[PDB]
Amino acid sequence: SGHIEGRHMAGSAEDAAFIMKNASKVIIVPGYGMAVAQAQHALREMADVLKKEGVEVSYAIHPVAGRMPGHMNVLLAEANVPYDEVFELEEINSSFQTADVAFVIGANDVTNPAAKTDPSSPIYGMPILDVEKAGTVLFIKRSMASGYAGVENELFFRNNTMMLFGDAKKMTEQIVQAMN
Numbered sequence: 631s632g633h634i635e636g637r638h639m640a641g642s643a644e645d646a647a648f649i650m651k652n653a654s655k656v657i658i659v660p661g662y663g664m665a666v667a668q669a670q671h672a673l674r675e676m677a678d679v680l681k682k683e684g685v686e687v688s689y690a691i692h693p694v695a696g697r698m699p700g701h702m703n704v705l706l707a708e709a710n711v712p713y714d715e716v717f718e719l720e721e722i723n724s725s726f727q728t729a730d731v732a733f734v735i736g737a738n739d740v741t742n743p744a745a746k747t748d749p750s751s752p753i754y755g756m757p758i759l760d761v762e763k764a765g766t767v768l769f770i771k772r773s774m775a776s777g778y779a780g781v782e783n784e785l786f787f788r789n790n791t792m793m794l795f796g797d798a799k800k801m802t803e804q805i806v807q808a809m810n
């Protein structure tokens with residue numbers, strides 16, 4: 631069950647299910663972590679349960695999310711995620727404010743502004759994804775560890791931010807189950 635630990639909120643699979651199953655608009659943010667666990671098929675399934683419940687789903691892709699340009703796009707296509715539901719940062723970063731939930735699965739650095747200050751990084755000087763602008767922000771990852779940038783993300787401590795610790799694929803699978 632959920633609970634507070636340190637300066638962050640640690641939710642559970644059911645919390646995420648309850649929150650999303652009851653929202654009207656969710657925006658999924660896929661990152662490296664999703665690729666490591668090959669959670670794309672589970673993720674698309676989740677999107678299918680939500681869409682069936684009337685919820686509005688779309689995906690926000692950051693230019694350098696993952697480990698190669700367009701990495702998330704091919705993974706989502708692989709899971710048969712409808713092409714029209716995937717959007718690039720420049721054409722959807724402003725839609726976070728009108729979204730109840732921001733489902734951030736396996737992403738970190740692509741949401742953190744503190745990550746684009748290193749000039750030797752592929753993300754240097756690039757706009758970040760505005761996940762905070764949404765009602766609630768779910769972060770699916772194994773721990774409180776940093777990303778490729780090695781810097782700490784300050785969104786893990788926000789009020790509208792709930793951490794869902796676990797494997798990107800395993801956790802998404804539990805959430806799907808909890809949703810039925």
Ligand SMILES: NC(=O)C1=CN([C@@H]2O[C@H](COP(=O)(O)OP(=O)(O)OC[C@H]3O[C@@H](n4cnc5c(N)ncnc54)[C@H](OP(=O)(O)O)[C@@H]3O)[C@@H](O)[C@H]2O)C=CC1
Binds near residue numbers: 663693739745772798
């Ligand atoms: N796209 C490209 O062309 C390239 C991009 N890069 C760099 O890679 C980064 C991209 O960021 P983003 O996509 O958000 O990736 P990140 O590098 O920020 O990592 C994402 C997060 O995924 C979590 N994770 C790792 N394994 C798993 C797992 N099995 N299940 C669930 N979560 C997991 C990590 O934490 P935890 O251990 O807590 O789970 C991690 O904090 C940027 O710094 C960028 O510049 C580098 C080379 C090329």
